[model samples]
Every structure is written in C-alpha cells, then in structure tokens.
Target chain A: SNARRDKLKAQIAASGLDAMLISDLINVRYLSGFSGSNGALLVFADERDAVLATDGRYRTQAASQAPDLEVAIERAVGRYLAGRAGEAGVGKLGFESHVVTVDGLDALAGALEGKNTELVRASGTVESLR
Target chain B: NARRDKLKAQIAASGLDAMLISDLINVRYLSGFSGSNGALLVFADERDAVLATDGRYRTQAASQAPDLEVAIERAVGRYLAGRAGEAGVGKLGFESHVVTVDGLDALAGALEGKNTELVRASGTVESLRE
Candidate 1:
C-alpha cells in the first residue's frame, strides 16, 4: 500500500496537485487493495491521507486490505474526504473529471465550500498509467 | 447472454449503433453490476461492451460484469463516447428518462466533436429489463 501510495504521490506531485480524490474503484483497489462497493481514497502530498468507505459493510474489508492506511467509515465518503482535505490544509485537489457526475461534483464542492481546496479537473492522469 | 442480445436488438430498432447506459439499473440489467454507480456502452455489432465506474466498485464491477470490458474511472461518458466511435456506432442512444439536463450536457461535452450522434432514447433498454 505504501509503495502504491508513494507512486501515486509522485504522480500527484508531477501533476501539480496537492491531493487527488481517487473515485475510480479500480484505482482504489490498486492503491489500497480495499475493493468495496462504496469507497474513495484521498491521497495527499505533504500530509497523512485517508481512505473512506461508507457504512459497516466495508469496515473489516477496508481494514484488512489497507492495513497500514487511515481508513474511515463514513456515510458520505466523498463529502467526508473533502472535509479531510480541509483538515490537511490541501489547496489544489484533483478529482476524476469524467467519472464524477454533475450532481456528484456539486456534492464534493459543497463539502469544500468556504475552504481553500480548489477542485481541479484532473482526468485520466492516474488512469494513464493504470 | 440473452439479456444482452435483446439490448443489441433494441439499439438496432432505435437505429442506433450503440446504447450509452448511464442509468445504474439499466447497467445492472445488462452487465450484472448491482453497484449504485455504473455506466455501460453496448454496441449493435460484434464488439464487446464497456462498463465503467469509480474506484469503489472495481471488484464488484468485475465480478458482476465480467463479460464487459470494465473501466475504472470517474465520469466515463467521454471515455465511452470514444468507444462508441471505435465500435462503428454513428448514433449513440442514451436514457432520456434517467439523465438530467445537466447530465446530458456533460455527456455532450464529453462526446463533443466525436463521430457519433447522441440520441435521447427512452424505454428501449428499460423495456428489455422486464
């Protein structure tokens, strides 16, 4: 998990993003090995990042798969991770441009409202390698 | 398999080369993914279909939609638009009943300048669900 996160961090750094909200489930499983129906990963550049899964369905699965990562069980994974970006002082946050629906993007933005995090449409940069 | 065959027939009936399935229920009906978030591109020809979702459903998408070429990404409209072109689909049909104006706008943005036409189709694939 550390190696994958490190590689993704390197990619994020090269892309000029402070953090990336990984909405691609395949990328999530690739990065953290936590394959769940409702999961998202917040990987940061200079701070502790988080992996989130909603409800208790993924509690054990996330813990077991992403053993060394900070896994949070929340009802709203995207909103929750957006809040984490605020806590970590993230400035430029990247998101899956094509995967997030218009409404879904609004929800993520709502979570970062009045915050410093700027939602960047960083599309296929991660998937280019994945 | 029969379920999938019926969809291809429906696309032909609509005079479309393929159907762009953004509605999760339709996605599930065609590809077997029960995950709440999924998109599918089913062609009228021999080319295989594509299924896409965020990172949360990598394993589930694979398990459920094994017959499809699963893509792990956010916002897959643009991705599937290209696939539609690749599949020689000149007219792409979408679920008018399921997509909002904003959603349709986003899909148009993704499908911009592609060699395909986006048709506001309804009840064709959904009717097959029954």
Candidate 2:
C-alpha cells in the first residue's frame, strides 16, 4: 500500500500545489477513498504526507477509506484545519475558490487571520487530486 | 404553496405520476441542500425516484445526496429511456419547460409503442426536493 501511495505522491507533485485542501466531498472520495457528508484533506507536495478531517459520524469510515492519512475527528472542521495549518507552518494555502462559498471564505480568513497566509485561489478539484 | 403538496399527494393517489424539478438553487431549497452542479430527481411516490447526473458528478451526486435515489444517466433523454418500460408508468407528465425539444424526442422514443401520453405540469417541481 505504501508503494502504491508513492505514485499518488508523485502525481500530487505534478499538480503544482505546495498544499491543497480537499473540501469538496466528491474529490475527497476520489483522492482518499472517503465519501461521508463532511470530510476534508490537506496534502503537501514534496512529502508523502496528508491529514484528513471528518466529523464523529465518519470516524470509522475515514480510517477504513484512507488508512494512509492521519484522521482528525473534530466539531468545527475549519477550526481544526486552522490549527493544523498553524502547526505545520503552512504559509501558502491554496483553495478551490469557485466551489468555496463566501461564508466559507470568511470562516477561513477569520481562522487564519494573522498567519501571513498567502491564500491562493484555484479551480476544478479533480486536477488538484491527481 | 402547500397546495403543491396537496397536488403531489393527488398524483400519488393515482397509479401513474410525474413531477419535474428544474430550479437549480431550488433543488436544495426543496431538498435542504446546495451544490453548484446539476442534480435532479422525479419520484414515483416513495417507492421510485429517478435522479440523473453526468459522469463527472457520479461521485458528487453520491456524496452530497446519497439519501436521494439516483442513477448515473446524465441525459434526461437517456434517463427517461431507461425508465419508459416500467409496469407502473402508464402515462408521463413532464416540465415541458425543462425538457428541451431533443430531450422530448428522446422521451417520446422511450415512451413510444405504448399508451403513455406526455402531460405537461407547470408550477414548481422544487417543492418535492425540499
């Protein structure tokens, strides 16, 4: 499984995102094998590393779907994301702006307000996933 | 209008029934969901609901709306074709406004060689999804 995952790691490199957030549920299913109502993934380029976040309902499902990822079960996923990004020192954050709602943007900005975050806008998530 | 439900129930009382849900935003408004992509369904009472989506959205439809019955047939023409052979479908009502000429032809083809007649029902089909 680790060996097959390397191929995905290489594909993520080709996608040109230093970091990516999988907010769209479909893309999350495509990438990490999880398809619960609410789930997200953060993938970093250069490293075969990623983190998945989902609510209590998906706790068991997330692990079964994405055994390779470190799953975080939390109440407010956005806040959990901010905490993760803060700890990782992720300066440049790329998001799917077209799909992201104005309310979602506001929440992200408010959470990462003072981090010198270089938030970038991106398009269709399928490209970002593979 | 609550009258909508009264009529919907009326249709359910009949052996044959149809409804058209076209308003994109109203899709979720009726069904308590909001997604940018296309998602539509017609219910033949609580027993049969036909939902359609493009290949791109097969995964999406499953995730945002797993609870709603769905089929991956992207085109309404194809969707109707697949269902035209049912024993319960004696007649068909469509939102002629939503079904284009080409699509209508497709429905006619699927519905051909049978006693099925296309009835045009106006007003909002959105209330069903809600």
Candidate 3:
C-alpha cells in the first residue's frame, strides 16, 4: 500500500505534472483515499498537499472518504480545470481523451485553447482512473 | 404478456421508477421477443412502450415484442420518433449510447413535446451484449 502510493507520486514528479485532474473516483480514492462519486482532484506532486473539486452529494463523503486532501465543492469540474489551469498558467495538462468525449474535450479546449497550456493525453489504466 | 409481467414485477422490486427493457435478449428470454432492431421501454405503472424494427422485421416484431406495447416502426429511429414526448415523462432514461445518433435524435425530438429530461442509462447492454 505504502509502496504503490509512493510509486504513483514518484511518477507524477518524474512526469513534471504539478497537478492532476483525477476523474476516475476509484483511483482518486486509491491515491488520495476519497471514494465519493462525481468529482475531480487536483493532486499536487508533493502527495500530502492537494485540492479536490466535488459536488454536494459527495461533500460529507469526500471529506470522510478522503480527509487527507483539501476539499473544494465544485459542480462544473471541467470548467474549473480550464479556469484553474489558465489562472496558474499551467504547462503540461494530462488529459483523459478516451473517457472525455467530444463535448468534454470541446469544453476543456474552450477553457485552455489560447493559453500556453499543453493538454497531454493521460493514457492507460490511469486515464480511465483505473 | 405473462412473462413481461413477471419481469416488470422483478424490476419494480428493485425500487426503480420504471424498467427500460432494451436488451433484446432479455426481451426474447421473456416473451420469445426477437429482432435485430427493436426496443421496449416499459413504464412501471402503465403497460405501454415502443416496439421498433426495420421494415424487414415488421411482422416478426408484432408477433414477438407481443401485447405489452407494439409499434410496427420500420426503423428504430422512426419508432422512437415523438415516442418519449407523449409519454408525459418528466425525467426518463434511455439507452441512448447503444441506440445510435439517429435514434437518440428521434428520442430528443420526441422528448421535446414532454417536460422530460432523457437520461442516458447504461447496464442492460453490458449485461446482455456478448
């Protein structure tokens, strides 16, 4: 358990990802210990310090499920991603193109289209939040 | 008819508002229902739904989908056209992804008539599609 969490953190650091948009709630829970439904997490490379965006349904659950991270209640996570990334002027944004459909990509693109942001495909089981 | 009643009863027992009978196999498993292009969306309270198929399977659809509710629609699109609207359904779920772009468009048009939000529900296809 400790080793896997440590390895995932190491991978994020090696990849130069400042934060990750964790969509697969299962993986979010696995990595950050949050099992709530419908939300995304902005995991910091440091692992111990990160932010989570979720909805009302998962308010208590998010806190209880993954008390390790700072929780921010946000309904429109994609919109938040665009705004957050833009505000921070993020560099490489790892995206999940497979689960993220046309409408989803369009929304994200609209948010980060002209910005100096690189939307990289977060591939493999990680992309699907495996 | 008798087999449908039993299945509907079982679905109701699960505490669902309505049980959408989309998987043709379960439909077949119930009432000898057969067809490559047809769906039966059963309401919990009422015995009414659409039976869709291409022109070639018209006769077979009538004989097979049986007395629950029948529509000799030549195509699944045409059959579902303006079907969900008149149902007076406020929030109804459909097998939209499996139903195809044309089919969902018809369902959307039909739903326009009703104050309904057509949700894309999954599971039936996953359980049945081999």
The most accurate candidate by TM-score is: 1
| B81-116: candidate 2 lDDT, tens digit per residue | 446445345555555544443455566677667666
Which portions of model 3 miss their true places by more than 4 Å? A1-6, A46-48, A125-130, B1-130
Among these predicted structures, which one has the highest lDDT? 1
Clashing pairs in 2: B30-B129, B30-B130, B31-B129, B31-B130
Return the candidate ranking by lDDT, descending: 1, 2, 3
Candidate 3: clashing pairs of residues: none
Candidate 2, residues A11-126, lDDT tens digits: the string is: 54565555666577876677778888998777665564778899999999988888888999987775567557756777666666646644465567777877766555655545
What is the model-wide C-alpha lDDT for candidate 1?
0.79
List CA RMSD, all candidates.
10.0, 14.0, 12.2
DockQ of each: 0.07, 0.02, 0.04
Q: Rank the models by DockQ, top first.
A: 1, 3, 2
| Residue lDDT tens for model 3, A1-130 | 2444556556666777654565556666666676666777655456355567788888888788776667878788766755676667567766544355434555677888678877655544353223
Q: Evaluated with DockQ, which candidate comes out highest?
A: 1
Per-residue lDDT of candidate 3, residues B1-130 (tens digit): 5555554554455444344445566556554657766666655455565566677776786676556456666555434545654655455555543443334445667656567665555453244334
Off by over 4 Å in 1: A47-49, B1-130
A41-78: candidate 1 lDDT, tens digit per residue? 89887646555555578888888888877788898888
Q: Judged by DockQ cut-offs, is candidate 3 incorrect, acceptable, medium or high? A: incorrect
TM-score of each: 0.54, 0.47, 0.46
